[PDB]
From Swiss-Prot, chains A, B:
Bacterial hemolysins are exotoxins that attack blood cell membranes and cause cell rupture by mechanisms not clearly defined. Cell-bound hemolysin, which releases heme-iron from erythrocytes by interaction with the erythrocyte membrane. HpmA requires HpmB function. It is found in: Cell outer membrane. It comes from Proteus mirabilis. It comes from the Bacteria. This is Hemolysin. The conserved amphipathic domains in ShlA and HpmA may be responsible for pore formation.
Amino acid sequence: NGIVPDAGHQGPDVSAVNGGTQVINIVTPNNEGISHNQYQDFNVGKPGAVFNNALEAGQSQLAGHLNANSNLNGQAASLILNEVVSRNPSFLLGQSEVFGIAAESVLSNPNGITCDGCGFINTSRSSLVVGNPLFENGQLKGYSTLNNTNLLSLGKNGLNTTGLLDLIAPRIDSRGKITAAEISAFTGQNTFSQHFDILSSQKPVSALDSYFFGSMQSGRIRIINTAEGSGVKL
Amino acid sequence: NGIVPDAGHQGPDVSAVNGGTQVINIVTPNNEGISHNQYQDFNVGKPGAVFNNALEAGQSQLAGHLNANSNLNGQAASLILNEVVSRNPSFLLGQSEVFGIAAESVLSNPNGITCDGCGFINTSRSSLVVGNPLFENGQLKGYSTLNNTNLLSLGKNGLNTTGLLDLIAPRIDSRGKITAAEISAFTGQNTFSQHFDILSSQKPVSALDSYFFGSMQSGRIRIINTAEGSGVKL
């Protein structure tokens, strides 16, 4: 079980279907259209993971036939926010599919995220955030990598998506091919809006250096580092 | 003589002052504030080059005391456009200084540009364009890398400026440290506005691959590649 939901009211139902593929019946979206899911563990293996954002039954790419997600109450999520609330880092070694209505997804894990041969299907924008979401009375305000020196790692087998990609972390170490419509990498200790506008920054006590090996197959690449003194190594 | 002015009406007066440092009395700016200088050769050696954009005499960093540039007719250039009109590629191995009023500079050379330990002083924005400027009845309309497969090379000794940096070429091969306030790299076969907005693009017949080794010391990096199929290698 790569993905283990939190026991609380934001923990989605997670099941394994033959092959080891995980199916996540994401929790009911709030009024902002955000399905806020909380996890003790979030890891995707080679068999992949399917997030059920479907209003009607159909064929998924990774898990075959699935019924609709009745949690949706007739309205699909605009954003699937996957928040790790434990101390466990995340490893993504396979494809994450949004089944049903295309949506944005965010994985937040302040303990670290590693993507090695991972990818995203039917996801308009995928963000990996080594940090925490920011909430104000239940409403999503943005994200934080403050007080954090952990790593977003991208392995030799790379990352693929046909949609937009955001890479947000105190530091990034990438060793493979990143394929995306657009790539946005924001490094350092920062607070962000919901749209990853940088709102504030800390200077780390020690250097937070990022490294990009390999390649980027994308028509538009942006790298923003706010750690004064720290560099981007290629 | 690294820098050799064109014989025509856009050729500036170029002199060498002791040490081998070149001093360029740039031509009178037009009504858009552009000093359009044309060259048979444009190369900067270790002693550097000083572009005289001064309304009053003073001390230059690279060439010591200089008098004002009387060509200016009381108004300094906003943009110093340095256009190579021959077949000769450019090598920049030293610092280019704007003496006097800070200005933007552009070097256009469709035959190729190599920067190895080069830099820019008192230059708010420096652009290196492996392509040609576009004119309409004397007015600068933008730039073109169409029908061009030549290289912008950045060597192991890198490039430094305290200002903005644009790198525009069919392909880029960088092997050193690029230090700038912001770095913008636009690759492929493109037409550009004066502000390097991409207006149109060609698909090259063969791959135009760019390579970035080394590092980038800059808070904001953008890489835009329009060559569909071609990649950015790190």
